[PDB]
Symmetry: D2
Subunit: 319 residues, 4 copies
């Protein structure tokens, strides 16, 4: 039987006999993802170029997500990569959910038409205070749901909840997300590692050794492949689909890494673990970090559990 | 003034006072690319999944059929077909086309960028057309380019008049001219190759890559990018500058990429954009192929970066 | 604040604190409409014509499969199916749906407007589900409406809360609420019927139309419009006011339009929009059907115009 | 073999060994039609309704701008513009175009069909371009046609080689040839006009229409259809046969429809398909216009039916 995102989420929401607020939010997010996809694919660009005789894509992506989440009545604190402060939903539109999102991740590299994406994490508001920015400072362990949209050769939405990970393919002819991969699980061990090796000069010594182990294996077995798109959603999704390891690790020049904990690292870690994978900073599980700043950075190394462990053994070797 | 791919090609063709045969070819290819783009973005996927109760084969069928029926071609070489296709007599025109209809399609399960690559030659003689007609060096290219099915769909067309970039507007099914007469940066800050094969590197590649990470003049190291789809990597090299390497090694002394419909059309685009493309030993466009599926090592991109690679290569003789 | 069909139905469903089964039904129906609209606009037609080397049956299969798989229905009546369809036990829900999946599709070769019409009943009896379940009078409707595949695709949904109009934005595949709680004009200036049957008209219809061309009060005559596709004619009537008539004639002594899936859903939308719908003898919504494909004469539209016709009807006993 | 409008026009242009200027025009027109179609189907409407926080004017702009930038035109006459538009010298070409960019847009609120009508003349003299270049009789048309934005979008193109119909595939933005060299039925079964204004009918129309409803023999009366949008009614007349009338009366002795960009292009299409088009006194294509916006009565369609109307018309003269 064919399944769409909206049918799937209404079905699970009825099994769980919830109020519907989470379902309303995901549906609002889904509309936003389709609007972003259409704009990323440059629909209507002919009008920018005078066919009949105007806002940047990440600004528009941010406006779309913000506006669709606010008007769902299901949220109260919204944190975006684009906004310094948490947005507090106005009283008449407030619901019980906190959302952290990157509206168009990888948009620095969009001039070359590389893959871009939207990342999101959804927390229940855990306190009875008046809603504030503090409500977004929960660890990834507390996520009710997370996922990402990938605007690649086709548009795919990956949704992770406590019942597992499911992949939906956008059918642009009818504007519906069709469930194509049910209950997804990552390979125990992959054959690809992914990181920016152009910065090897600054590598932590463990990262240098681990990558040396991938290119020059001690038992003279076959080397791993290298891939690095430079867009997290693209790189993380390839890890999920083919197995392997993705690294944006810490170094002495960037002791906490570069990616953001709330709206990049935590949702990707959540998808990974729900698929049977691992995600570490090296010192701790990504999801166990209690953030003190909504825009704080976190190092991340994720992928197949065996590949992340081998990096950890090398990491332990260098203390 | 707004410009479309079709309008642009008819204007240049009228300037040259040609017969229209190349214009008819390019328009058919333009149509094929739009069909491939629609399928690649998964239009109609709901019907595959039972809403009412392969992709590179379809891409090849799309390109094959639009070219055959364009009446401008006589020999078609595709990555998908071991032998050249000889167009049937009523449909023959004077052009040879070499193409990869969906380059990068092994890794489309992760939705990575894919693309179509093409190079167009003229028929080599008035005899009955044969596969030999596709064995010309890249220097003979009349036109070449690629479509990139990325976050958006873009067509890059390289002709003697230069390189122009068209963005597919999906709302109207038209290629809008967005980058006229495009030129690559003289020097970039990005290198692109699969470093997982570092065990097999030629010493010049080992040395050249070492200089990118540990610059002798204390400048900032290059960033690394490798999508693993040539069209994506080459297009990024064109747009941002840098260098793309798929070089020869001890296990593949002639490389991995195919010369006719991957290396040569990209080499032509690169040179037409002010960049360079070498095998290390010679310019790619100067290699005379003997087999339609022969491989070639390739190092392409910004001229200062390719020249710098060639100095290291000559250092190791 | 922007509103979509899915968002609207969920907001209304949670106000009512229902289980969601109706919302699941409507969402499945909306998806079928989007896919039907894509087929009507001929997306993918190029592949039928060999770019790589029936519409009402497809429309029926889309509505059938989406309703069956919604788990919300138990009896399905379609213009395309001789018998009611009984949903298999594991997929049964509490609703009966009667629909014309592609109304006007005989006259579609001229690209006339086409549409989907639907009416939704709660199953009223506790017997094992059967054809009898769809034989309820229109008064019992839970929801009804239509999709018009015209110059744009619009979905009209009438419920107890009134009539709402959603515009399909094809760029994102979403139904946008554009007309909230719509009410028809009290009196219009257009009449709509096939005047080619003037030879078979009953005296009251003959007289009513004569009054439209020759008003006794020297006011302006009404304009006439007749597309020949019920969704198009009724929707213009809803949007601009006026009157639509398909009375009985010698080829159709019980009228021509179908009671279950044409007259009742339109009568429901009209009355929820402040309009009227009569057979001449009784309200359409008060007709108790005995046969699922049975016909009814229909006169509907703005209330002043329908009353004016009814006054003429009583004049002739 | 699959055929597109662009491919078709290039093949026809090479048979005739023309310069390409007309082909550049039609291709520019085809692009404008696709953009118009996208807007009529309401793509991006979500943004108007605040998802992130003009239609006949846009149609006129799209056609004006695509014609100007084709380098194929010198005088442009539009229903939207009081005066003929003179293309600037540097963009001048040899053709005069008269068009209605969005005919029927008065009733577009009911989502009824709308359309673009166009007629293409060669400039006949070397004088400075002025309105006079647009005052040719329809006999001089080089090409004419219309786009119907209906249940699907179809482009009808009439030239000396006949009438051909192209279906827009929206998935790829391509007009697919679906009906080659079409001819209207010798006689139809449909009459089309606004019978609401029968009070003001010319007595000859009164008798003609009365004969369609009450045949003197035992044949079947005609059915009536009147969409109220000329492209829709005319296109149905083309596909199914019959007669479309927008005739003169004492209140409108020259009719209502405009001669240059409504009556003439349809007359040309009709005659190229084996149909007829008269004002009652003469063929529409024989009128020598004196004003770019002058009106002309039109009765067009199957030849047996127009001849029969002309018989009744002379009876009252
Ligand atoms: O949506 C609902 N209930 C509903 N009742 C009727 C309809 Br129709 S939907 N509850 S929910 O709390 O939003 C929820 C709970 C679990 C999951 Cl897994 C998801 Cl996705 C959503
Ligand atoms: O197309 C033409 N002639 C034409 N005449 C009228 C029209 Br309309 S097009 N010639 S051609 O050989 O195909 C050619 C030549 C140069 C370039 Cl640059 C390109 Cl693209 C194509
Ligand atoms: O849908 C629901 N409940 C829901 N709970 C959570 C969500 Br999310 S929806 N109930 S219903 O019976 O289907 C109904 C009732 C009234 C109307 Cl007006 C409509 Cl449309 C539908
Ligand atoms: O287009 C051309 N020539 C061309 N040369 C190369 C190409 Br490619 S097209 N000539 S034309 O005057 O525009 C013309 C003539 C007859 C028809 Cl029937 C049409 Cl459509 C158009």
């Amino acid at each position: 039987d064919v399944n769409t995102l909206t049918r799937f989420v209404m079905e699970e929401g009825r099994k769980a006999r919830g109020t519907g607020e989470l379902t309303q939010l995901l549906n609002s997010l889904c509309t936003a993802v389709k609007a972003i996809s259409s704009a990323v694919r440059k629909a209507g660009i002919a009008h920018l170029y005078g066919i009949a005789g105007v806002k940047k894509l990440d600004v528009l992506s941010n406006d779309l997500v913000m506006n669709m989440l606010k008007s769902s009545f299901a949220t109260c604190v919204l944190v975006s990569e684009e906004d310094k402060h948490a947005i507090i939903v106005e009283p008449e539109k407030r619901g019980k959910y906190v959302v952290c999102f990157d509206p168009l991740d990888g948009s620095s590299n969009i001039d070359c038409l590389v893959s871009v994406g939207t990342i999101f994490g959804i927390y229940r508001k855990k306190s009875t205070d008046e809603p504030s920015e503090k409500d977004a400072l929960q660890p990834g362990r507390n996520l009710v749901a997370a996922g990402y949209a990938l605007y690649g050769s086709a548009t795919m939405l990956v949704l992770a909840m406590d019942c597992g990970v499911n992949c939906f393919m956008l059918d642009p002819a009818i504007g519906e997300f069709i469930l194509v991969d049910k209950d997804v699980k990552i390979k125990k061990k992959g054959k690809i590692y992914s990181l920016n090796e152009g910065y090897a000069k600054d590598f932590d010594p463990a990262v240098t050794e681990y990558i040396q182990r991938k290119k020059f294996p001690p038992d003279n077995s076959a080397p791993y492949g290298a891939r690095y798109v430079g867009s997290m959603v693209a790189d993380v999704h390839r890890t999920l689909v083919y197995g392997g390891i993705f690294l944006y690790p810490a170094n002495k020049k960037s002791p906490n890494g570069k990616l953001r904990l709330l709206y990049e690292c935590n949702p990707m870690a959540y998808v990974m673990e729900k698929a049977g994978g691992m995600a570490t900073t090296g010192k701790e599980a990504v999801l166990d970090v209690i953030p003190t700043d909504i825009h704080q950075r976190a190092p991340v190394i994720l992928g197949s559990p065996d590949d992340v462990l081998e990096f950890l053994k090398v990491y332990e070797k260098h203390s």
